[PDB]
């Protein structure tokens, strides 16, 4: 995850962004589909 503290009003910002490792969790169970929450 990265917060990206920059302003692009409507779409993805042009700039290059790097994502750093934050959380690791062990599950062992295959995830195949998923959904988002409002």
């Amino acid at each position: 995850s990265k917060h990206t503290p920059i302003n692009l009003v409507r779409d993805l910002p042009q700039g290059f962004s790097a994502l750093e490792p934050l959380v690791d969790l062990p599950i062992g169970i295959n995830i195949t589909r998923f959904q988002t929450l409002l």
């Binding site: 062990p26 599950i27 062992g28 169970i29």
Partner: protein
């Protein structure tokens, strides 16, 4: 009552493996480190000299 008829606290431990990395692998040992002299170090990721 006699010892045969007296309560004994019994705890039973079940040791099994499931399809997941074994997250319980006991304690990890640790010993003192130094500087400026040849050593063999068993760091968490790897072993080296």
């Amino acid at each position: 009552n006699g010892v045969g008829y007296q309560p004994y606290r019994v705890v039973v431990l079940s040791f099994e493996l499931l399809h997941a990395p074994a997250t319980v692998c006991g304690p990890k040992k640790s010993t003192n480190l130094v500087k400026n002299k040849c050593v063999n170090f068993n760091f968490n990721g790897l072993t080296g000299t």
